Amino acid sequence: MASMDQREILQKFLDEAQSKKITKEEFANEFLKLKRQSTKYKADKTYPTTVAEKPKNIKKNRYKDILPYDYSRVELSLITSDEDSSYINANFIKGVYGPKAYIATQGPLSTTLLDFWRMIWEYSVLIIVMACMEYEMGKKKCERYWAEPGEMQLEFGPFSVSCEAEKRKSDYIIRTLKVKFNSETRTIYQFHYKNWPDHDVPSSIDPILELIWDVRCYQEDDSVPICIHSSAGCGRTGVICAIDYTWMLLKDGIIPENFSVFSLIREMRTQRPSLVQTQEQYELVYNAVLELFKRQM
């Protein structure tokens, strides 16, 4: 009944932050609860992945253990090939004000480059954020779906992608793409993040903040979904949403008196599986959110 002001709520958060950064295995135990909730959701078959488990879709899933929930999967309606199904390993992640703020998805496969672009198109996606390298752990983790300077135009079904510009920056690149489809030409902005903040090194978290701030300089609102992907579309994909989300609350003076990263992630994992893969990412989210709050003083 007696509401407290934003700042004060940040101070409550900051005050705690101190002891928590100490509380033994606090983060470990915290994250261990996330896995638990998932295990219970899978035991009760609460969130079906039937569509993604159909035979014809197996070739469209990069990892067998990462399957999009049915009720929150991005359905592909745009038909261009007598062989275009509706499936795609991706989910809608709700935003601070409503559904479809994000499209957490995997790195497209050679066999899903078409479906990828259908999606981006059908939902007028303006921003695409790639949070990974094409090559990691000695192997390929994402297929080429964008176009690079002086490289003409790659073709996926009826889509034409050419790279008009490519503003390289500190830790990421901004490819200004032009996609053609049935006489229509749209501009998509891809934010390729090759590096990843250093778990315990507070200084290394700044680059990731720069990205979202940059990303948000291109699309302040939530009119259209923001596509965010990694190899699997769970871990790093999940770190970006949460921080952007939290940041969105902070940018509008609406951080719930009882805000917590654990709860924000808990809720996100109900929309997309394995969102925020490990303890390290969990902690990164927490540390990054903390840095933001400190910056509000």
Next chain:
Amino acid sequence: YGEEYDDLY
């Protein structure tokens, strides 16, 4: 390709 994103990677 399908090979556990969790199983290490």
